[PDB]
């Protein structure tokens, strides 16, 4: 149907923004702290402590596949990426640190992101 043609063309270009989004959420994070699944090699105790691990190449992945639905959605996930990290991490740690900085920065962007979703009524 046409009606499930247009819908898919939203879809498609929710993906664009978003695309751009989490580009410029990655910028971000220049240390790519954040960028790859946290190594259950190199952290073997990770899932004894988060029980929804995330990062960038993951979200990513989804965002291909179009699957997220929705800003919401893929706020979601980029808040466990920051959220799972201030709490495996102490304060004091490098980790811990670049979370909070990306969280701050994030912040600016998904602000008008929230505005261009909703402008431009993509969900
Ligand atoms: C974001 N993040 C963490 O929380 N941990 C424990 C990490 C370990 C490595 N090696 C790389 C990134 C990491």
């Given at each position: 149907?046409?009606?499930?043609?247009?819908?898919?063309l939203?879809?498609?270009?929710?993906?664009?923004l978003?695309?751009?989004?989490?580009?410029?959420?990655?910028?971000?994070?220049?240390?790519?702290?954040?960028?790859?699944?946290?190594?259950?090699?190199?952290?073997?105790?990770?899932?004894?402590?988060?029980?929804?691990?995330?990062?960038?190449?993951?979200?990513?992945?989804?965002?291909?596949?179009?699957?997220?639905?929705?800003?919401?959605?893929?706020?979601?996930?980029?808040?466990?990426?920051?959220?799972?990290?201030?709490?495996?991490?102490?304060r004091?740690?490098?980790?811990?640190?670049?979370?909070?900085?990306?969280?701050?920065?994030?912040?600016?962007?998904?602000?008008?992101?929230?505005?261009?979703?909703?402008?431009?009524?993509?969900?």
């Open positions: 149907s046409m009606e499930q043609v247009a819908m898919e939203r879809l498609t270009e929710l993906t664009r978003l695309r751009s989004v989490l580009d410029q959420l990655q910028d971000k994070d220049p240390a790519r702290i954040f960028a790859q699944p946290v190594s259950l090699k190199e952290v073997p105790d990770y899932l004894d402590h988060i029980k929804h691990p995330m990062d960038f190449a993951t979200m990513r992945k989804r965002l291909e596949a179009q699957g997220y639905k929705n800003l919401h959605e893929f706020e979601e996930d980029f808040d466990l990426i920051i959220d799972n990290c201030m709490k495996y991490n102490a004091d740690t490098v980790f811990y640190r670049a979370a909070v900085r990306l969280r701050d920065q994030g912040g600016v962007v998904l602000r008008q992101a929230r505005r261009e979703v909703d402008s431009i009524g993509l969900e």
